[PDB]
Design an enzyme around this catalytic site. Structure first.
Site, mmCIF file in Angstrom:
data_model
loop_
_atom_site.group_PDB
_atom_site.id
_atom_site.type_symbol
_atom_site.label_atom_id
_atom_site.label_comp_id
_atom_site.label_asym_id
_atom_site.label_seq_id
_atom_site.Cartn_x
_atom_site.Cartn_y
_atom_site.Cartn_z
ATOM 1 C CD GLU A 1 -2.525 -1.419 2.607
ATOM 2 O OE1 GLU A 1 -2.365 -0.575 3.515
ATOM 3 O OE2 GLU A 1 -3.312 -2.377 2.708
ATOM 4 C CG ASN B 1 -0.665 -7.192 -1.125
ATOM 5 O OD1 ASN B 1 -1.282 -7.899 -1.924
ATOM 6 N ND2 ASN B 1 -1.072 -7.004 0.124
ATOM 7 C CG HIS C 1 -9.414 -6.468 1.932
ATOM 8 N ND1 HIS C 1 -9.577 -7.605 2.694
ATOM 9 C CD2 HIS C 1 -8.110 -6.124 2.044
ATOM 10 C CE1 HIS C 1 -8.420 -7.936 3.240
ATOM 11 N NE2 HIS C 1 -7.513 -7.053 2.862
ATOM 12 C CD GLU D 1 -3.940 -8.321 2.510
ATOM 13 O OE1 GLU D 1 -2.731 -7.999 2.461
ATOM 14 O OE2 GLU D 1 -4.798 -7.636 3.099
ATOM 15 C CG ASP E 1 -11.891 -9.788 3.372
ATOM 16 O OD1 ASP E 1 -12.048 -8.809 2.613
ATOM 17 O OD2 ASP E 1 -11.070 -9.792 4.319
HETATM 18 O O1 LIG Z 1 -4.235 -6.126 12.890
HETATM 19 C C1 LIG Z 1 -4.422 -6.769 11.637
HETATM 20 C C2 LIG Z 1 -5.020 -5.777 10.634
HETATM 21 O O2 LIG Z 1 -4.050 -4.789 10.324
HETATM 22 C C3 LIG Z 1 -5.485 -6.461 9.332
HETATM 23 O O3 LIG Z 1 -4.409 -6.752 8.500
HETATM 24 C C4 LIG Z 1 -4.179 -5.818 7.420
HETATM 25 C C5 LIG Z 1 -5.508 -5.484 6.715
HETATM 26 O O4 LIG Z 1 -5.277 -4.597 5.601
HETATM 27 C C6 LIG Z 1 -4.416 -5.181 4.616
HETATM 28 O O5 LIG Z 1 -4.311 -4.296 3.560
HETATM 29 C C7 LIG Z 1 -3.036 -5.447 5.223
HETATM 30 O O6 LIG Z 1 -2.169 -6.000 4.243
HETATM 31 C C8 LIG Z 1 -3.192 -6.411 6.403
HETATM 32 O O7 LIG Z 1 -1.930 -6.626 7.015
HETATM 33 O O8 LIG Z 1 -6.244 -7.663 9.572
HETATM 34 C C9 LIG Z 1 -5.579 -8.599 10.444
HETATM 35 C C10 LIG Z 1 -5.357 -7.959 11.808
HETATM 36 O O9 LIG Z 1 -4.790 -8.900 12.704
#
Ligand SMILES: O[C@@H]1[C@@H](O)[C@@H](O[C@@H]2CO[C@@H](O)[C@H](O)[C@H]2O)OC[C@H]1O
Length: 324
Positions: free
Chosen positions: A131, A172, A208, A237, A239
């Site tokens: 990001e 990513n 997401h 990731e 969902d």
């Molecule tokens: O604390 C964690 C959160 O930060 C989340 O993880 C993030 C969600 O956003 C994504 O873009 C990131 O790559 C990812 O690391 O969800 C899991 C929690 O444990």
């Protein structure tokens, strides 16, 4: 007929993100069993991030991460590293002091070389930079960017590759699945990086999303343009959040339709090497806490029972296998 069995027949990986200390969960045995039965690729949800793996400037803790790798190796799963450079979950020794370009570059280089070298050959894919683009289509004003300038991105990739030349290094991000201002900036960014020899091996689409899905034509075209840059593609990731009020049955049906469509499109592009969900059971998901009013975005419910989307995905996979 598990998801990983079907994945193996299609030469792709299907996996999940592993929650912190899953080995000590009250229901660790069940969590681990469903995981080993269904997936062949694992991404540590948080335990490979800065704050855990590099708690102090001169101290490293690979203990939790090693347990993720150990579980993966013992269950024939490859490991997806996450993440080397990000603006969140950074330790106090980083955010609590002022830095100069040269100082932060040395810190970044040491972190990357130390972590990647530690897992050399054991982590097949690394989310090198996560990001780095704002939701306005510009460079995200993180500590890295403000202190170092855009070169921190190119350098992170170069340093990671030196530490493990066999690792697949990817960029990513979220909300870049479709063709839009953000994905356009990412596309041009990666195009220019590879043009100067930067080892950006692939691109990761977080995915997401919600029950409304995406503009599929745009998703299809976006996948093709990135593939043409010589990039391997990863859905990292995934969902599909649904509202937690109206007709659950209706939303789960839409959720299943969205998943099926995403898989259908991804499998049709040879560049997509893996598809992972940010977790796998609604019992353990970050969605409810991040997206107010939403949840139940995964493959299995709170009791580890398969949801409609699980079957919809399996159906698509089976279809592709027979078609070829
Ligand atoms: O604390 C964690 C959160 O930060 C989340 O993880 C993030 C969600 O956003 C994504 O873009 C990131 O790559 C990812 O690391 O969800 C899991 C929690 O444990």
């Amino acid at each position: 007929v598990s998801l990983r069995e079907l994945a193996e027949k299609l030469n792709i990986y299907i996996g999940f993100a592993a929650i912190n200390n899953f080995w000590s969960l009250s229901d660790a045995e069940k969590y681990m069993e469903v995981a080993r039965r269904e997936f062949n690729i694992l991404t540590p949800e948080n335990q490979m991030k800065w704050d855990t793996i590099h708690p102090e400037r001169d101290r490293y803790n690979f203990t939790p991460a090693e347990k993720h790798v150990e579980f993966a190796e013992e269950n024939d799963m490859i490991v997806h590293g996450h993440t080397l450079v990000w603006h969140n979950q950074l330790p106090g020794w980083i955010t609590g002091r002022e830095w100069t370009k040269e100082e932060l570059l040395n810190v970044l280089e040491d972190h990357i070389k130390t972590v990647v070298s530690h897992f050399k050959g054991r982590v097949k894919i690394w989310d090198v930079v996560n990001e780095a683009v704002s939701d306005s289509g510009t460079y995200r004003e993180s500590v890295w960017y403000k202190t170092i300038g855009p070169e921190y991105i190119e350098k992170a990739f170069r340093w990671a590759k030196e530490a493990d030349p066999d690792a697949i290094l990817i960029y990513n991000d979220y909300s870049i699945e479709e063709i839009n201002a953000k994905s356009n900036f990412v596309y041009n960014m990666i195009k220019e990086l590879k043009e100067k020899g930067v080892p950006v091996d692939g691109i990761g689409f977080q995915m997401h999303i919600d029950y409304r899905g995406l503009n599929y034509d745009s998703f299809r075209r976006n996948l093709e343009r990135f593939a043409k840059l010589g990039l391997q593609i990863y859905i990292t990731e995934m969902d599909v959040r649904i509202p937690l009020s109206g007709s659950e049955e209706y939303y789960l049906k839409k959720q299943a339709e969205v998943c099926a469509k995403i898989f259908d499109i991804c499998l049709d592009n040879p560049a997509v090497k893996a598809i992972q969900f940010w977790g796998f059971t609604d019992k353990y998901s970050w969605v409810p806490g991040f997206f107010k009013g939403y949840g139940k975005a995964l493959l299995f419910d709170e009791n580890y029972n398969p949801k409609p989307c699980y079957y919809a995905i399996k159906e698509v996979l089976e279809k592709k296998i027979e078609e070829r």
